[PDB]
Amino acid sequence: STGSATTTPIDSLDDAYITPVQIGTPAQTLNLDFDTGSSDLWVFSSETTASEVDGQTIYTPSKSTTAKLLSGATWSISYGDGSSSSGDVYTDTVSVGGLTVTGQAVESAKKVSSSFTEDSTIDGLLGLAFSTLNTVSPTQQKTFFDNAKASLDSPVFTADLGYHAPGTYNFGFIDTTAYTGSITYTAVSTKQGFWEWTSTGYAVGSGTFKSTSIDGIADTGTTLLYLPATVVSAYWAQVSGAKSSSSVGGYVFPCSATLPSFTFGVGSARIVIPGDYIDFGPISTGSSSCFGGIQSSAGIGINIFGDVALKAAFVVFNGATTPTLGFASK
């Protein structure tokens, strides 16, 4: 089997991407944030505290003939941005882009933090990291990908995120028309439950490539590119007037700037992030100070190849017995 679904930016900055997912019988379609940095499929639901719902579409298990309470199971998750959610669990039929999993754990939110409530466009998350990070207790649950894997033509999914445009998540096949040149594959460590890999270095603009190992995670659920302070300082030093602002929470730059590109290494290959992808616009409405899309990972504890980086590539998440990651230009 295979699946193919379009993923759409939630706003004009590509802050996140939503992908329609069918849950239950008859189908209830919710727009979920596919997140390769976590491993829970959770949804706004008929059980979510009413004051914490503001415009989201909810899953109502009582209206699904295939829903079954997973008795005794609870979940609770906290994300790197400080947001959180928790609740109980049902199993139900879940389909993405024509690919159907029966008995998928659907984690029903009883509580969500304010950032979730305030984002009316995101109806929940669909985790695509390794199932060892799943938070369901006392019986840990498998991700949608893990459940689908054995039925897939090939044990892979791909992320093809758009810049200010829709893109695609495919399951079970590699669309050879969706990228240019060849795919370069690189080793993955699953030790921390993430799609963790080591970039071979970077360049700023038309500058020379610096060969240096940068361990980080491929994370579709993080907006920005978070890298070591040395690397980030070298990038922003090439933008007149750019500075790190503790008051704003990272690097800002004059909105009048033209940003240089940023290149990262994948083995001997190179992925170029155009300067425009690094512009996240005014820090507040009407400001002439703009927020940067490359920020320091210092104090996160891990480097994160988020959407800024991933949307510059066609990315293969290879879930074979020995997982790997592939990157192609597009």
Side-chain angles (χ1 to χ4, degrees), residues 1-62 64-67 69-109 112-141 143-148 150-190 192-242 244-330:
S1 62
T2 62
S4 183
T6 298
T7 193
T8 302
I10 64 163
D11 63 24
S12 67
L13 300 177
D14 298 345
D15 281 314
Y17 298 79
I18 49 169
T19 308
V21 176
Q22 281 71 48
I23 308 176
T25 309
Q28 300 179 39
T29 298
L30 273 66
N31 296 330
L32 306 186
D33 183 351
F34 284 22
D35 180 15
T36 63
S38 67
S39 306
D40 286 49
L41 193 174
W42 75 259
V43 297
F44 278 78
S45 75
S46 58
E47 302 179 330
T48 310
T49 301
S51 66
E52 295 181 349
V53 183
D54 188 3
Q56 295 80 10
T57 293
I58 61 165
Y59 168 59
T60 303
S62 65
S64 173
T65 59
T66 42
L69 179 73
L70 185 62
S71 185
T74 56
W75 63 280
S76 181
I77 192 163
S78 303
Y79 297 102
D81 68 352
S83 65
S84 64
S85 51
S86 62
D88 55 17
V89 187
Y90 294 82
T91 55
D92 208 339
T93 302
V94 173
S95 301
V96 175
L99 169 65
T100 300
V101 168
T102 59
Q104 175 63 45
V106 177
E107 301 171 36
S108 170
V112 304
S113 65
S114 59
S115 54
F116 288 116
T117 298
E118 294 164 357
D119 189 354
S120 64
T121 71
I122 291 176
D123 301 325
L125 267 63
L126 189 150
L128 292 167
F130 293 88
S131 293
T132 54
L133 293 178
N134 176 266
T135 76
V136 177
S137 180
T139 308
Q140 188 173 59
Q141 300 295 304
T143 70
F144 174 83
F145 179 53
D146 205 343
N147 281 323
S151 303
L152 294 179
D153 292 355
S154 179
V156 305
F157 68 91
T158 65
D160 181 10
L161 303 177
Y163 169 65
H164 293 350
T168 305
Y169 282 102
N170 292 328
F171 291 84
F173 72 106
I174 288 160
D175 181 357
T176 60
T177 71
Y179 61 88
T180 59
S182 57
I183 306 176
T184 299
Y185 290 87
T186 196
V188 164
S189 172
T190 63
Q192 293 192 87
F194 298 120
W195 292 93
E196 186 170 4
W197 65 290
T198 304
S199 170
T200 49
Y202 71 99
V204 177
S206 62
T208 59
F209 188 84
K210 176 73 168 182
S211 293
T212 185
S213 294
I214 304 169
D215 294 339
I217 68 167
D219 185 0
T220 58
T222 291
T223 313
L224 307 185
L225 175 51
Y226 294 89
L227 292 171
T230 46
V231 177
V232 176
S233 182
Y235 177 81
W236 290 108
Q238 297 306 308
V239 179
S240 298
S244 183
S245 167
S246 55
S247 57
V248 174
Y251 281 90
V252 296
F253 67 93
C255 293
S256 61
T258 299
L259 298 178
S261 63
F262 183 90
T263 300
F264 64 94
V266 183
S268 60
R270 307 285 180 257
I271 299 296
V272 181
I273 306 170
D276 291 346
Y277 289 26
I278 298 160
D279 175 22
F280 279 76
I283 61 172
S284 296
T285 306
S287 179
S288 69
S289 179
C290 274
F291 199 67
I294 295 177
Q295 297 292 345
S296 178
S297 65
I300 294 177
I302 200 158
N303 300 306
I304 307 173
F305 293 86
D307 297 334
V308 165
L310 302 180
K311 74 179 81 170
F314 177 85
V315 189
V316 180
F317 293 80
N318 171 28
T321 305
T322 298
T324 63
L325 273 173
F327 292 82
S329 293
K330 68 190 183 187

